[PDB]
From a paper:
Pq3‐O‐UGT2, an important UDP‐dependent glycosyltransferase (UGT), catalyzes the production of Ginsenoside Rg3 and Rd by extending the glycan chain of Ginsenoside Rh2 and F2, respectively, with higher selectivity for F2. Pq3‐O‐UGT2 catalyzes glucose transfer from UDP‐Glucose (UDP‐Glc) to the C2‐OH of the C3‐glucose of Ginsenoside Rh2 and F2, respectively. In this study, we elucidated the crystal structures of both apo Pq3‐O‐UGT2 and its complexes with Ginsenoside Rh2 and F2, revealing the acceptor recognition mechanisms of Pq3‐O‐UGT2. The NTD contains a seven‐stranded parallel β‐sheet sandwiched by seven helices, while the CTD comprises a 6‐stranded parallel β‐sheet flanked by 6 helices.
Compared to the apo structure, the structure of Pq3‐O‐UGT2 with Rh2 was better resolved, particularly in the Nα5‐Nα6 and Cβ2‐Cβ3 loops, indicating reduced spatial conflict during crystal packing in the different space group. In the complex structure, the density of Rh2 is clearly observed in the NTD of Pq3‐O‐UGT2. However, the electron density of the alkyl tail is not well‐defined, likely due to its flexibility. In the complex structure, the NTD, particularly the Nα5, Nα6, and the Nα5‐Nα6 loop shift inward, with the most substantial movement occurring at the N‐terminus of Nα6 (≈5 Å). This indicates that Pq3‐O‐UGT2 undergoes conformational changes during substrate binding, and the binding of Rh2 induces a more compact conformation. In the complex structure of Pq3‐O‐UGT2, the His20 residue forms a hydrogen bond with the 2‐OH group of the C3‐glucose of Rh2, while Asp116 forms bidentate hydrogen bonds with His20. Thus, His20 and Asp116 are proposed to form a catalytic dyad that deprotonates the C2‐OH group of Rh2. By contrast, in Pq3‐O‐UGT2, Rh2 adopts a “lying” orientation (referred to as Nα5 orientation), with its tail extending toward the Nα5 helix. The Rh2‐binding pocket of Pq3‐O‐UGT2 is composed of His20, Phe15, Phe117, Asn118, Thr139, Ser143, Ile146, Gly147, Tyr164, Leu181, Phe185, Leu358, and Leu362. Surrounding the head of Rh2, Asn118 forms a hydrogen bond with the C6‐OH group of the glucose moiety, while Phe15 engages in hydrophobic interactions with the glucose ring.
Numbering used by the authors: 8 to 69, 90 to 171, 177 to 227, 236 to 289, 295 to 442
Write the structure that this text describes.
């Protein structure tokens, strides 16, 4: 009934843990605890009445080496609370270790895709064998943090007790979920997806547009596109003849005359854009994204098709995944054709306004409704399986 969540020391991993807290606290009255430094706790000081937030402290020298030393603080926190279960992230390293010290079961929480992880663990469990689904990875042609990254992944997959929580749903990759289950010898439990004055202009502009006609573009923080990269997608949006809303992020670089040339038909935003509010709006019918996992989950929760412009890390593997189930399409690449006007305009026209992408549109809605039809019960089964894991540990000798 009482769970304690230790997310990693990164903002990209605090929001999933916080929304999981909100979702598990509103059902079965789960006495929730969430521990992380106050710097990462205070971002979620808004509508969090159901969960209980816990502080975590470290001391300086003379989060890098602090992470590697704040272990005892988490151990003291666990001894003070004595919770029935611990949910850890990717790189706490010692959190499973301490959970095994206080006789507390530790359940791993994967905030990434089953498909992506499946390639990696297949690689560990089957070094010689090839991927069971060659439509996703062809280990054939080319197989040329080092190993410290691999070991952390296989450890956080192995150290999980019985089950492994995942921020995913069956309707997107149940086959890869079952593959991961068979690979890790653990049961993969999907928890489904998970959910200032300047924002009224975006909504006011978006309300005046027709249904499923606006294309949202945002590529996330970090790896800030060069002006040469910006100009390609800018001209692709200009020649797409479709309404778009583009958000782009320390020297300031910008295309010359582009904002003037397009006049309206498009709104440029500097910082935080209403991603969820734009995707959920009925006027939106396209999302040009860098294929971040949380971004893909948000795009799929509202039935908005995906325009894949991945670049690094798991974003390609995520991207093509959206192209496998038929809810998205990728842009053609040259030597580095991720910045080309013709491919971007072609895919945008085909997905949003053309009939050839209707198969992508319908399947985007037919799946979205699915996510709202079987909703809430995924987390119910997750909670009851967590209760089963807690009650099976109740073993004296
Ligand atoms: C060829 C090799 C070596 C292995 C074969 C497997 C493979 C086909 O190739 C691909 C397929 C599976 C793969 C994508 C792998 C990559 O290798 C390594 C990634 C990685 C560990 C990298 C760090 C990432 O973690 C991010 O790290 C960023 C840095 O800060 C943050 O910005 C993000 O917030 C944070 O999520 C996260 C945990 C999401 C992923 C998890 C999945 C994994 C293993």
């Amino acid at each position: 009934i009482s769970i304690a969540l230790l997310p990693f020391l990164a903002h990209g991993h605090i929001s999933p843990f916080f929304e999981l807290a909100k979702q598990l606290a509103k059902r079965n009255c789960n006495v929730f605890l969430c521990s992380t430094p106050i710097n990462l706790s205070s971002i979620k000081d808004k509508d969090s009445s159901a969960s209980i937030k816990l502080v975590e402290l470290h001391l300086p020298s003379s989060l890098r080496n602090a992470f590697e030393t704040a272990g005892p603080t988490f151990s003291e926190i666990l001894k003070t609370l004595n919770p029935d279960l611990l949910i850890y992230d990717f790189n706490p390293s010692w959190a499973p270790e301490i959970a095994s010290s206080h006789n507390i079961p530790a359940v791993y929480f994967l905030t990434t895709a089953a498909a992506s992880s499946s390639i990696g663990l297949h690689a560990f469990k089957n070094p010689g064998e090839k991927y069971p689904f060659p439509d996703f990875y062809d280990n054939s042609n080319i197989i040329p943090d080092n190993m410290k990254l691999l070991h952390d992944f296989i450890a956080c997959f192995e150290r999980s007790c019985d089950i492994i929580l995942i921020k995913s749903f069956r309707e997107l990759e149940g086959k890869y979920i079952d593959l991961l289950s068979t690979l890790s010898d653990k049961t993969l439990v999907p928890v489904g997806p998970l959910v200032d004055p300047k924002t009224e202009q975006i909504i006011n502009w978006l309300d005046k547009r027709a249904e499923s006609t606006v294309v949202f573009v945002c590529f996330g923080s970090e790896y800030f596109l060069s002006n040469e990269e910006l100009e390609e997608v800018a001209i692709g949006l200009e020649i797409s003849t479709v309404n778009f809303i583009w958000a782009v992020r320390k020297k300031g670089i910008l295309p010359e005359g582009f904002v003037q040339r397009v006049g309206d038909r498009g709104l440029v935003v500097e910082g935080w854009a209403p991603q969820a509010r734009i995707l959920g709006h009925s006027s939106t019918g396209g999302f040009v994204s860098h294929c971040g996992w949380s971004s893909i989950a948000e795009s799929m929760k509202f039935g908005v098709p995906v325009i894949a412009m991945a670049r690094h890390l798991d974003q390609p593997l995520n991207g093509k995944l959206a192209a496998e189930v038929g809810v998205g399409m990728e842009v053609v690449r040259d030597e580095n054709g991720k910045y080309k006007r013709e491919g971007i305009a072609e895919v945008i026209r085909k997905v949003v306004v053309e009939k050839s992408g209707e198969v992508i549109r319908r399947k985007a809605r037919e799946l979205s409704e699915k996510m709202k039809e079987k909703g809430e019960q995924e987390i119910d089964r997750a909670v009851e399986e967590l209760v089963q894991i807690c009650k099976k540990k109740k073993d004296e000798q």
